[PDB]
Amino acid sequence: PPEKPKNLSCIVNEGKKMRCEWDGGRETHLETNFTLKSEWATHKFADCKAKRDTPTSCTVDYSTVYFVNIEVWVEAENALGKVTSDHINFDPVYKVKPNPPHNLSVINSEELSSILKLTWTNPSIKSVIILKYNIQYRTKDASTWSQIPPEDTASTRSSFTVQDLKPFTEYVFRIRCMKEDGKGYWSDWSEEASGITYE
Amino acid sequence: AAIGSCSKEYRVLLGQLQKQTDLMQDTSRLLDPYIRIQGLDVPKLREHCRERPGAFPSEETLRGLGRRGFLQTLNATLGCVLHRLADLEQRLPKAQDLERSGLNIEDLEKLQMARPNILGLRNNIYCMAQLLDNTPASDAFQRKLEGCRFLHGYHRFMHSVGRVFSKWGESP
Amino acid sequence: TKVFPQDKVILVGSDITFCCVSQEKVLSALIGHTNCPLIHLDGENVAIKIRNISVSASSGTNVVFTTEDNIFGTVIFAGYPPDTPQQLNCETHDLKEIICSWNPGRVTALVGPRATSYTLVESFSGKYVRLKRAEAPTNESYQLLFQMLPNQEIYNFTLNAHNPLGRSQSTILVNITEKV
Ligand SMILES: *[C@@H]1O[C@H](CO)[C@@H](O[C@@H]2O[C@H](CO)[C@@H](O)[C@H](O)[C@H]2NC(C)=O)[C@H](O)[C@H]1NC(C)=O
Ligand SMILES: *[C@@H]1O[C@H](CO)[C@@H](O[C@@H]2O[C@H](CO)[C@@H](O)[C@H](O)[C@H]2NC(C)=O)[C@H](O)[C@H]1NC(C)=O
Ligand SMILES: *[C@@H]1O[C@H](CO)[C@@H](O[C@@H]2O[C@H](CO)[C@@H](O)[C@H](O)[C@H]2NC(C)=O)[C@H](O)[C@H]1NC(C)=O
Ligand SMILES: *[C@@H]1O[C@H](CO)[C@@H](O)[C@H](O)[C@H]1NC(C)=O
Ligand SMILES: *[C@@H]1O[C@H](CO)[C@@H](O)[C@H](O)[C@H]1NC(C)=O
Ligand SMILES: *[C@@H]1O[C@H](CO)[C@@H](O)[C@H](O)[C@H]1NC(C)=O
Ligand SMILES: *[C@@H]1O[C@H](CO)[C@@H](O)[C@H](O)[C@H]1NC(C)=O
């Protein structure tokens, strides 16, 4: 006889359906078909079925609606009985995993020999929620990646200036972003962009 | 089983309502895809897409309404909008048709995403109300203009309801 | 009504003459994006000539007549005759029903309540089957089921298609026993 699962968590990508995962538990040599119920306060959505390839993950068939508390729970059943996991409710806007800012470019200035200007393009989520960034840079020959303090990049923007890089060296940059309040998941690192300071 | 109220926090509920209205207030999101898909992307033709008087309630009436009749009229108007939007979606073309023509599927995606947005807004209005607890035949060219005017009126109503929600900040 | 004709189905490439009756003066007339000169008639009525009309979209190349106060217009549908059904084959799985597969061929560029209705009819028995508005993509080559008639093996099917512009047919003789 199997036992109830746990470790339930759900993640929402940019403009896609919400997937959820759980744990397998102990093995009982008996076939088990997993299913999780998702419902609003008034609307009862469809159900998943644990595929034979991956019995701990499904992709729902309904479009995601933000700012609406949805209640999700998994019910495990077999030939010997059924049992339901715990019930949690969460705003789907708190589980969003945005995309990395694309089109990164580095432009210098012919007036000062210690500054660099960073430009990028934010995804479409910037219109829904406020987001923050983390700007990491390093020298061309130095493999260690330094990080700019996040206190300067705690709001949405599309430009930033680096400082204190005096003599004629090349630098590579990268940036990621997530929700402002820290709730959610950090995006992937953007493409590395190079730039040479002024002489 | 299923909870009667989806949440019990007045503050986060009001925040969700305000964010929903401010998001659904997007003419560029809803109306413009319709004008683009119906072939009316010509300046003079787009100039005639104006709301007719008496289509949706007025800002003065929404301001005069209280906290219960306001939610009731909002629910009724959303129901009527859902009906007319189902009619429109029945009238809209298909994805392969749009591909063969040269239009953008993003319009169909935005419509099929805007309908569940209305459903969720109705759900949230129900949650807030529970938490409180105190033309025989028309022409093929006239139908397009009627739909455009209806969408413009809906956008005006969304702006009005968003301003009304943003008016009352916090209360017990 | 102010513009004539209304919602007419025409063949791609033929000429057509529109007309608008109105008491007030008309300023200009457009066909989608393209403009066309007006031909004055008796009174304030104007007419326009269209030659070698291109393929119209689904919504239709709606010709509009713009005045100083309002706007009037209609919709025209330019389409093609229906193509002859191609690659017609029938086989059986349990000797109870016959499924006949075919390809629609070249697209007719007409959709809505004007699509090509398909109807398969039997010669020896006169029985026919008609397809409903549910239309599958060409990706899944078209099919229609036909109940097998008891104590009969030879079958001679003829498929017929028809749109508001033309019709086409195809004939096949099959031995239902050698198609399992
Ligand atoms: C909002 O309007 C609806 C009208 O559609 C009212 O009626 C509810 O409709 C839903 C449709 O899914 C039913 O599930 C409910 O059972 C209906 N409720 C009743 C009481 O008939 C609904 O009551 C309205 N909500 C509020 C809060 O007034
Ligand atoms: C197969 O059935 C058809 C009727 O559907 C028979 O009649 C022929 O129909 C075609 C139309 O596609 C005509 O061109 C022929 O002239 C018709 N022939 C006759 C004799 O009427 C057809 O004969 C049947 N085939 C066989 C081999 O019997
Ligand atoms: C249609 O197919 C059936 C069987 O698939 C054919 O019937 C066979 O005829 C041969 C004689 O040539 C016999 O030896 C077989 O025993 C028959 N098979 C049966 C009865 O199952 C029939 O001749 C075919 N018709 C045509 C016109 O070719
Ligand atoms: C699931 O278990 C992992 C470690 O096994 C740990 O992150 C935590 O206990 C659970 N994760 C979540 C997101 O609840
Ligand atoms: C899944 O497993 C359960 C466990 O007995 C079984 O009853 C059911 O038939 C299986 N299939 C489906 C589709 O539920
Ligand atoms: C970057 O910008 C260019 C033009 O400014 C355009 O292709 C697109 O917006 C972006 N492309 C990529 C690959 O990021
Ligand atoms: C119509 O135009 C097409 C291409 O624009 C041309 O190939 C065709 O010959 C024209 N037909 C006539 C009758 O002018």
Curated annotation (Swiss-Prot), chain A:
Outcome following mutation: residue 66 to G: Does not induce ligand-independent activation
Post-translational modification (record): Heavily N-glycosylated. Glycosylation is required for protein stability and localization in plasma membrane but not for ligand binding.
Induction or repression: LIF and OSM activate the type I OSM receptor while only OSM can activate the type II OSM receptor.
Impact upon substituting residue 48 to S: Induces ligand-independent activation
Source species, domain of life: Eukaryota
Positions of the Fibronectin type-III domain: 1-92, 100-199
Glycosylation sites noted in the Swiss-Prot or TrEMBL record: 7, 33, 103
Expressing tissues: Found in all the tissues and cell lines examined. Expression not restricted to IL6 responsive cells.
Purpose: Signal-transducing molecule. The receptor systems for IL6, LIF, OSM, CNTF, IL11, CTF1 and BSF3 can utilize IL6ST for initiating signal transmission. Binding of IL6 to IL6R induces IL6ST homodimerization and formation of a high-affinity receptor complex, which activates the intracellular JAK-MAPK and JAK-STAT3 signaling pathways. That causes phosphorylation of IL6ST tyrosine residues which in turn activates STAT3.
Subunit structure: Component of a hexamer of two molecules each of IL6, IL6R and IL6ST; associates with the complex IL6:IL6R but does not interact with IL6. Forms heterodimers composed of LIFR and IL6ST (type I OSM receptor) which are activated by LIF and OSM. Also forms heterodimers composed of OSMR and IL6ST (type II receptor) which are activated by OSM but not by LIF. Component of a receptor complex composed of IL6ST/GP130, IL27RA/WSX1 and CNTFR which interacts with the neuroprotective peptide humanin. Interacts with HCK. Interacts with INPP5D/SHIP1. Interacts with SRC and YES. (Microbial infection) The homodimer binds two molecules of herpes virus 8/HHV-8 protein vIL-6.
Protein name, entry field: Interleukin-6 receptor subunit beta
Gene name for this UniProt entry: IL6ST
From-to range in the entire protein, with total length: 125 to 323 of 918
Swiss-Prot record, chain B:
Post-translational modification: Propeptide processing is not important for receptor binding activity but may be important growth-inhibitory activity.
Gene: OSM
Residues shown, of full length: 26 to 216 of 252
One GO CC term, this protein: extracellular region
Taxonomic superkingdom: Eukaryota
Protein's recorded name: Oncostatin-M
GO biological process per UniProt: immune response; negative regulation of cell population proliferation; negative regulation of hormone secretion; oncostatin-M-mediated signaling pathway; positive regulation of acute inflammatory response; positive regulation of cell division; positive regulation of cell population proliferation; positive regulation of inflammatory response
Cystine bridges: 6-127, 49-148
Localization: Secreted
Record keywords, A-Z: Cleavage on pair of basic residues, Cytokine, Disulfide bond, Glycoprotein, Growth regulation, Mitogen, Secreted, Signal
Entry's Gene Ontology molecular function annotations: cytokine activity; growth factor activity; oncostatin-M receptor binding
Species of origin: Homo sapiens (Human)
Record's keyword annotation contains Secreted: yes
Principal location: secreted
Residues with attached carbohydrate: 75
Protein role: Growth regulator. Inhibits the proliferation of a number of tumor cell lines. Stimulates proliferation of AIDS-KS cells. It regulates cytokine production, including IL-6, G-CSF and GM-CSF from endothelial cells. Uses both type I OSM receptor (heterodimers composed of LIFR and IL6ST) and type II OSM receptor (heterodimers composed of OSMR and IL6ST). Involved in the maturation of fetal hepatocytes, thereby promoting liver development and regeneration.
Family: Belongs to the LIF/OSM family.
Swiss-Prot record, chain C:
Similarity comment: family membership: Belongs to the type I cytokine receptor family. Type 2 subfamily.
Domain Fibronectin type-III stretches: 84-180
Domain free text: The WSXWS motif appears to be necessary for proper protein folding and thereby efficient intracellular transport and cell-surface receptor binding. The box 1 motif is required for JAK interaction and/or activation.
Organism: Homo sapiens (Human)
Quaternary context: Heterodimer composed of LIFR and IL6ST. The heterodimer formed by LIFR and IL6ST interacts with the complex formed by CNTF and CNTFR.
The protein, known as: Leukemia inhibitory factor receptor
Gene name tied to this protein: LIFR
Illness association: Stuve-Wiedemann syndrome 1: A form of Stuve-Wiedemann syndrome, an autosomal recessive disease characterized by bowing of tubular bones and other skeletal and craniofacial abnormalities, respiratory distress, feeding difficulties, and hyperthermic episodes. Most patients do not survive past infancy.
Cystine bridges: 90-100
Function: Signal-transducing molecule. May have a common pathway with IL6ST. The soluble form inhibits the biological activity of LIF by blocking its binding to receptors on target cells.
Glycan-carrying positions: 52, 139, 156, 175
